[PDB]
Amino acid sequence: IPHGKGGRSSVSGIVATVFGATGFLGRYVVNHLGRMGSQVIVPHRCEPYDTMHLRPMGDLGQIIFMDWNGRDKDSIRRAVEHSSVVINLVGREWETQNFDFEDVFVKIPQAIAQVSKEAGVEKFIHISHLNADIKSSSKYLRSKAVGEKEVRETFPEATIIKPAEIFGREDRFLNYFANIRWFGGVPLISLGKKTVKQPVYIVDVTKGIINAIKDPDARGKTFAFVGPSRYLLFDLVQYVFAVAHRIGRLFEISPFEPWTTRDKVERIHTTDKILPHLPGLEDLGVEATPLELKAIEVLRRHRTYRWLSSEIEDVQPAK
Amino acid sequence: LTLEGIKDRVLYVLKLYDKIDPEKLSVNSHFMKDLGLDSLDQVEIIMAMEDEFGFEIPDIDAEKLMCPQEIVDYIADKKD
Amino acid sequence: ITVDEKLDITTITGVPEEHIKTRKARIFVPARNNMQSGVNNTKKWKMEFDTRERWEN
Amino acid sequence: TYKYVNLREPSMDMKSVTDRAAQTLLWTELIRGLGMTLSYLFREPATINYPFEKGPLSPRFRGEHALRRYPSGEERCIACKLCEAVCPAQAITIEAEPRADGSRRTTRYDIDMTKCIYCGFCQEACPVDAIVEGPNFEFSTETHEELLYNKEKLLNNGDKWEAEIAANIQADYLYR
Amino acid sequence: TSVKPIFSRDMNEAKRRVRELYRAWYREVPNTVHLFQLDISVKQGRDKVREMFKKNAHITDPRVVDLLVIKGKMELEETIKVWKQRTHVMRFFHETEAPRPKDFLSKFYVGHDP
Amino acid sequence: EYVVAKLDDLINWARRSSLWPMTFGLACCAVEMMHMAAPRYDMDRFGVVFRASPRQSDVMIVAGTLTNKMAPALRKVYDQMPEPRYVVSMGSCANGGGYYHYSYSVVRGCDRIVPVDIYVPGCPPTAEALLYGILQLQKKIKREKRLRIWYR
Amino acid sequence: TRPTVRPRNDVAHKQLSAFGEYVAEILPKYVQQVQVSCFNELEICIHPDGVIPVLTFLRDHSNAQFKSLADLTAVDIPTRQNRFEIVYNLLSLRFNSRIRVKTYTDELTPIESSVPVYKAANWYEREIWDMFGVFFANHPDLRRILTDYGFEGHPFRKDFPLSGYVELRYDDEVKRVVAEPVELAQEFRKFDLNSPWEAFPAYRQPPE
């Protein structure tokens, strides 16, 4: 039962759990539950010290850590037994040399869609992506739209989420560009046609969850996440060079965490804007955020001072 | 140093702000027995005619202007 | 000397925040705890405000 | 009264001024001390070789806390709510509630070990003479979730050595 | 009330004053916005200044309107110089703090008796 | 296969055996830090050489009381330190603030500002439960950089 | 009575009656009350007008030197209807004595700086502007000392709840150290010590 005011050292009655919640997204959600009060049980896989930069997030005795593997059907059953809502961000990019990647969107999201359903969680949640379509594409982008089919079977109440290409602070989406000091910028694939997607700013997505986290009355009913206006141009790859003015790694260095001459190059140009009829955002709102204004912050390079940026974009068309 | 110098500069500025005056660019506009705004707002208008065209109005001047007549004129006898 | 008489009811503004108009103070003579007979805890008109929620941590 | 320091005048005669010109130009001073008073290294070093040897103390020392009990144990604390009320820092927290027989004792007793400023005001207000600052600097754990103490951490920490404590007070209690 | 006023006399020289230092703020928001290496839309910096000066509007008196100034006249010392390190400034625009409901029925489900 | 887990008997024995602590003097607690580097209990030459510049350090140390105006300074300094960094608070005022914990101008606790690791408890910790608090931090590297590359 | 009770001394109490008799004699435009603290110290109740004036008389003379300014301070009393108070405190090096000068005020009424009389009220006047809010005019400089750059409350007066209104905490969501309203982990218990029976008869307040 909620008490007092939402500042910190308060209650607000919801427990949670957030699986994953180390890399870019999960760190940035829990930080919004280390404020309005919670009990956020964040487990994590292998990382003893990479989770510390998190701890000054909940006040005291709020967030609490466990250890788990995730192919053991017990490790997901020992935590969740006491919970209210449980969201799931788990999963990643490239196929691991260990995890074969095929069912880690299939077996894992179900492996935690095991006793969670049984044990009496509620308002269980999962992630989708705006561009994943069960027609043939894309080797990584596929197996994600299987969860929308395969996993939705279990837990008839989900409110599974479908956002766009997101740009954060430390994010890897818009940062693959501008790391491209290289033989030259070569768009994908050397064509200025279908860029770009709906680049929503990471706050609005992470403010969506906690707006549905007790919504009420969204369960089973899936939503998708609007971008800003409107579609976008090729200039986005020029815009990068317009302003830029041209966990558990190792001790020394790794062996392979590449640019992946594979799905990576073709996952970024898959575009496929999709069904509007999903509610999907202002209903869960109220949030929408632009690009032109919020892309200076995340981009700071070797001038570090000059900006003087006047150049904008129409939409662009198909708009 | 022309009366086409100081009537051209003035009359577009007052249009350029996003606030009240809608083409009252007639040179008399008498401000709040006339069109009307908050006193602090009238004190905004004074500044942009100085950074432009070069000028000061240090003094009780800006309190008496009340019309693009006087400002033009007080500029008129000022520069030339 | 600039004596410049005038009358404006003294008030002051901006130092606290929203607690100016939200609350109601109270001016009352303390009542003497009755378990003992000592009459010296009276005699000063204090003031004390409304009480808002204390919760549990 | 007074004294006057740095009030002197040079003598100004050629028996002296050589003695001050045999000084500037030949460095006859400035090698006096630090040609010498430095070495003077030949004294035995003074070091307490730490992991083994240790240094002095006194029976009145202050440190980690305890709660004694008499012979066969009564949990000497009666919960009279004093060592709580003289505490400057306000670390102490006490909640009594009548124990089954009807003799009163505690339930929660928590000394925060960060706030405690080490007075010696909670050793000296307890009339039944329970709570006692131990003489062991065993400390330093790695999580602030810890140093807060409960009751049933203290008693052990005060029954781990009572051969230390029970032999200090009987040196010290004759003074106060 | 008989006590010597501070600077102003009645309301005019006073309300010449508040008009005045406005510009020292209005002319200098942005030189900082490149100086601290803080990134915002420079027009924000001109909204807040005009958001504050409109705030305390109901003031009926001299020696109040002079009092507030003596605060306001100061800040231009620190800010136009660097005595703050990015984090004494940006605190004006509160980024992290979750919203307050301020409406009715949004309260009634969270928090007791405000 | 097994070479990795034998390699971390080197790199996880190197980082624990040479520390370059920064210190913050602020308040009373600074003097009972000095006497750790005075010859009685001799801090250096037991493997830990004393203060260096902000850039070259590993373990920063917070003594003293952290008011409002000092917070904007610390946060910044903690960053610039290289990777293998830790934060070891000490004294009853970096743990929740000694007393002054109810004051207006003292931050309450200095865990709130940074991800602090080890604690020590009391106006001045006795220049002993300091070193005892480090021989926690040289024993708090049992961790392995194996089993991040080499499991997942 | 002798063994444990502080033995008094009369001589010191005769003169500081005299020498203070007549500084109500030669500056009656200003001084409105004077008295002798039972411990042989003086308190001169002075209107707020003379501050620069009276000291200047105390600044030099052959019968009262009072060159050494020791302690400026303040006290803030509600239900005095003019809130604050000043207390100057001055030592006269030749004549071995302390004479303190009390001058009341309000927040709004300014008081005039003592800075040209003594150059050691330079700091002690910068401070008070921070804490209580008194505003000293014509002061070569007025700024913020002892306090952070954020405190808009002027603490030491009696309306500031001890813990200030904003705790501080650092979060990594961006890169600053930012300020969220104060949320404690313990109530700060309020004890209640004031015992009845009025143990002091001599100070007995008027009968009413």
Ligand SMILES: NC(=O)c1ccc[n+]([C@@H]2O[C@H](COP(=O)([O-])OP(=O)(O)OC[C@H]3O[C@@H](n4cnc5c(N)ncnc54)[C@H](OP(=O)(O)O)[C@@H]3O)[C@@H](O)[C@H]2O)c1
């Ligand atoms: N919504 C979007 O815009 C978007 C964009 C790209 C990708 N995604 C997908 O949506 C989620 C966003 O992830 P992200 O942005 O935080 O990047 P991320 O690097 O994939 O973060 C995932 C974290 O969880 C770990 N992890 C990987 N597989 C795991 C597993 N089976 N079980 C437990 N932990 C696992 C990862 O390594 P460790 O095991 O060592 O912790 C990593 O620490 C991911 O599922 C991602 O594949 C979403």
Ligand code: SF4
């Ligand atoms: S020890 Fe003395 S003070 Fe502490 S609780 Fe028992 S009785 Fe009360």
Ligand code: SF4
């Ligand atoms: S030890 Fe010092 S501080 Fe801790 S309680 Fe006893 S007196 Fe109060």
Ligand code: SF4
């Ligand atoms: S007690 Fe508080 S102040 Fe005295 S040293 Fe330890 S921390 Fe610094």
